[PDB]
């Protein structure tokens, strides 16, 4: 089996910047079979460069594609704002044909803290015998950030849950939700409900939190 | 020209088998190499096999091979894939993918399919609980959409009319097997005494529609 | 290579 390395798996580039992402294969690619890919979120992927060098008709051709053996890069000359996806090789030189795990082409920018908020469960939830506390993190960068429940200062493990949306459009950052969940009878057995932030724009962690 | 057009959504009990179709339209089917390729939830692309119409001719890749069949009806112009014993980790979107020509065919696969969404999972259909995340010079509120099943759910402010500041989280899947996820809008301080936000949820399979106002 | 076929297939109905 051909292992396809695309490395790194970000990078985070400027709007009229050059990108260029490798493609390594554990073996020599036969008869230089090799395609790239663009996929944006929750689109199907469209083909950029076949056969290492060709480029479709339809693609833009500040997209090119060089290489041959286990050593091929995709090159974009000055990228556009809608080039920031992620990119996939493939190779096909054999019946086995392969990906690689892609490259993310992300927006650099300033560092930027999250905006933390904590939101306690409703009174329609708790009426129904759940309670879910909610951490919002609005507005980061970069994509890393890390939150932590504390309930009277216990650290909490299997009880929750997050996720992040896709890069904004217009400001480049990320924000992510994560969610508590406890019986409303586990709930209502503690005071204290926490959510400690970590992430590089913060000196030190930050802590919202509310008392039952 | 060409264009291929998959069946839709499934939701599959574990250890059943589940089949995709895939009707091409424009251009020739029995002489142009067609593949499926899968892509699980914030996962990447992984091919799993062809067939040439026109010989009868499969290729699988070796991780599939014993639990999939790849056909081809050369009178309707569509393939179908087949995959047996299913287990959760093959939830992803499986797509079709015919390759391109210079015609001449390249290999590379030049046209796709839209996808479909094939769910592995012994969850019933279920409609959501949306529960207020209210507000406590910037102040941010929310809809928590809680326990519903399948996969999707849309969420609006105020009918479409508030766009900026809303994030919308992608759903998580719970121990349950239901899922949830939560949408949220920044907005000033100010506006909270006079300015109605309402979330509009919707869940098609369970016809979930819900338009909660959220206030302080 | 499976890749090859359809190549084949195209230089064989050609002529």
Sequence with gaps: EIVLTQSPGTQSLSPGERATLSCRA????GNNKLAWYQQRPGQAPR??????????????????????????????????????????????????????????????????????????????????????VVCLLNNFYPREAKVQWKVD??????????????????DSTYSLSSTLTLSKADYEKHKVYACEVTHQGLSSPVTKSFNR | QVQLVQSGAEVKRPGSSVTVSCKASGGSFSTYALSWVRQAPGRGLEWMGGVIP???????????QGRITITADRSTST???????????????????????????????????????????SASTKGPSVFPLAPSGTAALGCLVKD???????????????????????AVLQSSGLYSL????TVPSSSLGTQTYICNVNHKPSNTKVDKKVEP | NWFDITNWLWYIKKK
């Excluded at chain 1, 997209?63 to 992620?86: K, M």
């Excluded at chain 2, 939560?182 to 809008?185: G, M, R």
């Design chain 2, 54 to 64: 026109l010989l009868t001719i499969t290729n699988y890749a070796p991780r599939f």
């Design chain 2, 182 to 185: 939560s949408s949220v809008v």
């Design chain 1, 153 to 170: 200062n216990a650290l909490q493990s299997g009880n929750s849950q997050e996720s992040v949306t896709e890069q904004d459009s217009k």
């Design chain 1, 26 to 29: 554990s073996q020599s690619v």
């Design chain 2, 79 to 121: 393939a179908y894939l087949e995959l047996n014993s299913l287990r959760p980790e093959d939830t992803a979107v499986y797509y079709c993918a015919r390759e391109g020509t210079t015609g001449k065919p390249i290999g590379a696969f030049a046209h796709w399919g839209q996808g479909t969404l094939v769910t592995v999972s």
């Design chain 1, 47 to 132: 083909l950029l460069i076949y056969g290492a060098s060709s480029r479709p008709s339809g693609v833009a051709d500040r997209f090119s594609g060089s290489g041959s053996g286990t050593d091929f890069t995709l090159t974009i000359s000055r990228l556009e704002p809608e080039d920031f996806a992620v990119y996939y090789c493939q190779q096909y030189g054999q019946s086995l044909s392969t990906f690689g795990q892609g490259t993310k082409v992300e927006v650099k920018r300033t560092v930027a803290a999250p905006s933390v908020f904590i939101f306690p469960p409703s009174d329609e939830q708790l009426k129904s015998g759940t309670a879910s």
């Design chain 2, 148 to 170: 519903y099943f399948p996969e999707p759910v849309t969420v609006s402010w105020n009918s479409g009319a508030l766009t900026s500041g809303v994030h919308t989280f992608p």
